[PDB]
Structures are given as C-alpha cells and as structure tokens.
C-alpha cells in the first residue's frame, strides 16, 4: 500500500483561541460583528466528546473582556476627586418611615466652582453605606482609591453577546440533558457562534440565565469537597420584583470647567426602604426540587438544611443586584430558612460607591436616577456552598463562577484538515 494525502478531513483537536464578538451601552460596545439571522447548527451523529466547565477558557475570556470594557467605556468620564473633602452632615428626618431611620444623611460641603478662585456651598443626600464618620464625614474610599463617576448617558443593561470562532476553528456544543459539569456526552453539535449570553452581574442568586430543561441541575467540582461552589440551575424561573419607591431628583453641579457632578437632589413623597418580592409558593416548590436533587449525592434520608449566609462584607452576605444602573444589596434571608424533614419580602439597601471587579485601587460612583425604579427579573439559579444533616447556604465569589453557568455547554476546538491513510493506489 501507499500513502495518500487527504485534505478537508473532519478532524478536530482541543484549542484555545481568542473569540470574536457578534451582536450606547457599556458592554454592548456597538462594535461587534452583526450576527447571522439564520445561524446553522450541525448535528454530529455517533460523536461522543468530553467537556469540562471548570477548565473552560471561554470563561476566562468573558471575564477578561468584560473587565476591559468596563474601563474602556467608563474611563473617559468626570472624576470626583474634589468631593474628598470634609463633609458636614446630619440625618434626614423630614418625612421618613422607621425602617429608614439613619439610612440617609444630608451632607454639605465647600466645593470648587467654574472658576478656581471661587467656592460654592452645595449639598447632597448620601446613603449611609457611602460615608465614614471621622458631624464630620469622609466619603468611602477617599483614603483607598480614586473615585470616577460613570457617564450618565451610558447604559448598564446586560445586552447579550455571542462569541464566534475564527475560520479554521469551531465551537462544539453539548446538547445533553442531565449533563453535569464534566465528562463525555453522546450528543454534540457544531456551531460557529454561541447562543447569546447576557453579561448579568450578580451574587448569591443568578438572574436572567438559561434554564435546565429536565431537572434542576447541580453542578460542582468534586461535590464532597466543601471548598467548592455548587451551581444550581433551575428548570423553571422564579419571578422576583425589586423596587426603589422614593421619587428622586438630581442636581448638576459644576466642579470646574467642562465637568459636573451628579448630586442627589430632594426626595418627592415619603421615604421608604427598597425591597424585593419573591413569590412565596413558587420559591417553596423550587427549593423542594433542589433538595430532591441534592439528596442524590448525600443520602435519601439525609437532612438538608438551608442557612441565610456566612459572615462577610456586602458583596458576600447580600444579594448583588444591578438594575436601571442602580446598585442594590438585598438582605436574602428568609429565602434560605428550612430543614426539609403571598411573597417573601427582602429588605434591600442601596449604595452609590462601587468597588467591583477591581477590588482595590479603583472606585466608581453611580449617579442618581430620577423618578422611581421597578425591575422584574427571573431567578434562574443559585450559588451554594456546603458546610445526619448537611448545611447549605448562599455563596459568592468571583464572577467567573456565575458566567461559567452559561458556557458549560461549549468547547473550542481547532480543525486539522490535513492527514494521511494507506490506500491501494500509487503515483
């Protein structure tokens, strides 16, 4: 027999490449390749392939690009350095409920005007979570990082993007119900672009993601190792209704030539606490399903207890919710309060000085939004950690563990079209 060379052979190997974005908003960018209105999906009969969501470099690219965009989009904005001044500040008491006592403060200070030789006396209402008592206050992070306000015209809506492989590469999708984080699956198809993934940023409860189709999925590395996070994907949504009931106004204060600070204004109507409403019966059925599935790894008669949270900072102990461009830190307690052998109202706090992906060295100021905010989201899954009885509680961590829940189905491979085989022919 003789060597015969074949070109265009259907052979692939694991690979890492950068991916293309396909699709004014802070992440949308509006510089992505328009998507294919009629994308193809090609089924591969008799192909079994191995996937591993915990070692998937698509997660790392999503993380790196979203952070880089955050800065590329918010970098060319007004700095708030002039606000790191001693503030004189007292409590807002004029028309408040009991739940809001001490929550808001009326601060006033001496700040630079359009002319550098003149000062103005201005005021703003700040949330308690943004100041430090030295009646004299400092803003949080004036001793740690520079604070830049976000540009008021930039939207923070989690508009979905698609990732696309370069020619010569392809993305394999694992179309397999009941497939956990790792191992082979018998159902694979080839796509050029991923499904659209919304860059939703949250902690503890995953919002507006994909649903499982047959059962609540519990995906984790090891399971028995309690140092790892458990990603729980619901097969049904739980609807959650969040609100910020106070009717706000805002002020534009010049801080020098070409720049202005967005200060909060006065509040219209009475002052009430922000909150989220989770349908109660829906939540109770949803956890019952989570429990039945958890028992498969812990024992059929094992008690599964749900606790509120571990101790920690707001980014750990409260639900992190970003809607309308406002930043909420919700109590998330009472949702996880059972042993398993109307609506739930979750009190929620608001904070304007944000330290997010870059934990230190940089801060962003969320400008106020006038009017009242009402936001409705889908709870699609949980981040849980584990401690006769097993105890579970809401967890958190870097965003990579949340984004990987939308990318567990994908792997990047390279095409190797050139190869040989023995045949009965010759040159």
């Amino acid at each position, epitope marked *: 027999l003789w060597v015969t060379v074949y070109y265009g052979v259907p052979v692939w190997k694991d690979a890492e490449t950068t991916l293309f974005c396909a699709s004014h908003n802070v992440w949308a960018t509006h510089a992505c390749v328009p998507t294919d209105p009629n994308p193809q999906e090609i089924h591969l009969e008799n192909v079994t392939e191995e996937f591993n969501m915990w070692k998937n470099n698509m997660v790392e690219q999503m993380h790196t690009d979203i952070i880089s965009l955050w800065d590329q989009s918010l970098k060319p904005c007004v700095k708030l350095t002039p606000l790191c001044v001693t503030l004189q500040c007292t409590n807002v008491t004029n028309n408040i409920t009991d739940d809001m006592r001490g929550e808001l403060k009326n601060c006033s200070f001496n700040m630079t005007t359009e002319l550098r030789d003149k000062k103005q006396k201005v005021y703003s209402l700040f949330y308690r979570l943004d100041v430090v008592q030295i009646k004299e206050y400092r803003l949080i992070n004036c001793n740690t990082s520079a604070i830049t306000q976000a540009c008021p015209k930039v939207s923070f809506e989690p508009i979905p993007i698609h990732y696309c492989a370069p020619a010569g590469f392809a993305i394999l999708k694992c179309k397999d119900k009941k497939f956990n984080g790792t191992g082979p699956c018998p*159902s694979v198809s080839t796509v050029q672009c991923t499904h659209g993934i919304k860059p939703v940023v949250s902690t503890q409860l995953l919002l507006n993601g994909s649903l499982a189709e047959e059962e609540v999925m519990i995906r984790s590395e090891n399971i028995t190792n309690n140092a790892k996070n458990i990603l729980v994907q619901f097969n049904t949504p739980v609807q959650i209704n969040c609100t910020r009931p106070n009717n706000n106004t805002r002020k534009s204060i010049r801080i020098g030539p070409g720049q202005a600070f967005y200060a909060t204004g006065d509040i219209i109507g009475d002052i009430r606490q922000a909150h989220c409403n989770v349908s109660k019966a829906t939540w109770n059925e949803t956890l019952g399903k989570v429990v039945k599935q958890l028992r498969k790894h812990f024992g059929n008669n094992t008690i599964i207890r749900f606790a509120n949270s571990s101790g920690g900072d707001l980014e750990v102990t409260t639900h992190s919710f970003n809607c309308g461009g406002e930043f909420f830190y919700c109590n998330t307690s009472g949702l996880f309060n059972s042993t398993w052998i109307d609506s739930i109202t979750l009190p929620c706090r608001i904070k304007q000085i944000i330290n997010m992906w870059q934990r230190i060295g940089q801060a962003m100021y969320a400008p106020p939004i006038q009017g009242v905010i009402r936001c409705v989201s889908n709870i699609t899954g949980l981040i849980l950690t584990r401690d006769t009885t097993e105890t579970f509680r809401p967890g958190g961590g870097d965003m990579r563990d949340n984004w990987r829940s939308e990318l567990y189905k994908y792997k990047v491979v390279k095409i190797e079209p050139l190869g040989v085989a023995p045949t009965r022919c010759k040159r």
Partner: antibody
Amino acid sequence: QLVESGGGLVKPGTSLSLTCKASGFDFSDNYYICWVRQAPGKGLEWIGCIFTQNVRTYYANWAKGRFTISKTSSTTVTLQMTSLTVADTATYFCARFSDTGPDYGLGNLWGPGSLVTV
Amino acid sequence: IVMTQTPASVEAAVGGTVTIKCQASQRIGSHVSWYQQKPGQRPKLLIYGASNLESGVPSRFSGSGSGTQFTLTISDLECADAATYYCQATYDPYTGGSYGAGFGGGTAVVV
C-alpha cells in the same frame, strides 16, 4: 394509577381530545408522560412525550402536525388529534416514565388504555 | 427515530431458552429498555437499561448491549409465557433528551 378516557367511536375527518389522570399522584415531579399507540395486530408505536415540571414536548416525526400534547390540571394531561383517519384506529395509552440515573426510562406505569375507532 | 428489531417469531419448548435482538441506527450508549406485552394487556417493564432488571422481574430474564447492538435472553421458559417483546430507545441523540423516544418490536415468543 393512570386512567385514560375520552375514547370511543368517531367519524373520519373529525378532531379528538383524549385525556388521562394520575390517581394518587401530582405530576409536579421529575416525570415524562408519553403517549403510545397500538393498532390491533401491530406493535407499540411512539406518538410523543411531555415533561411535566417544565412543559416541553417532543414528538414522533410521523405525528407532527397531527398530534399535540399539553398539560392542564396538576393531575391530568391531554393528547389532541388535529384530524382523524381510519388508519388511526388504535389503542391509545399514556404512561409514566420515571427518573433512574441518567435515563427517564422507568416506563413502569401504564394505564389500561382506551380505544379510538374511526 | 432509532430502533429496529429482527427475530419476528420464535418457538421454544418449556424449560428452553430464546433470544431476541434489536439494533439502533444511532449510537445510544446503554439506553435501551425492554417490555413484555401479554395479549389483551398493557405492557410490563422488564428492563430499565441494557443491563438492569426491574425489581419483581424473574431472574431468568437478562440482557446486555451497547452502542447499536442490544439483546434479551429469556431462559427457563415457563409454559404459556407467551408475549410480544419490544425495545425502546430511551435516549434521543438528536435532541439530547433522555426519555422514551422511538419504540418498535414484535417477537411472537410462543412456548
């Protein structure tokens, strides 16, 4: 526990809704309920399935546009024929396929079935 | 959209053994269930997957298979244990679901 109804003799060209109920069970569990046909003298043929926690359905290719499946009450399901012909005379059964490992293959609860004659 | 069955009809003496065989047009792992249907009755499940019997099923029923080749062996045949046996693919390799998705058969086992 599954009991079929809505059968009987119907005229060619009409539509038909068959239903069944689970006596003693809520369907809000990890179940597939599937409809299976058997013409007299023939083997068993798959029509389609409904997943009950998240209503999603799957159909046999031959059944597309001819049959639809839906859930109604928490304890009942339905199979709707969009048109009937004489070739559709058969015994119809609903059955529950429970959860074992990686496979909802525990097709152990079958109703007695009902007959549809056209 | 997966299974086919080939033996059609088999006869055996009481106490004898028969086998039947099914094939899949697509690889389906071990996802094949088996049923026993007596005349005039709704079918009974015998086998969950290629290698697993349902509790209550006599030990004389056994089987194996993988990929596309699946079989059922019925030993120690009892008198008048006549039935039509069937195969079901419990895995749909196209949609990824794992539920009964295609059924077929016919064995006429008579004893």
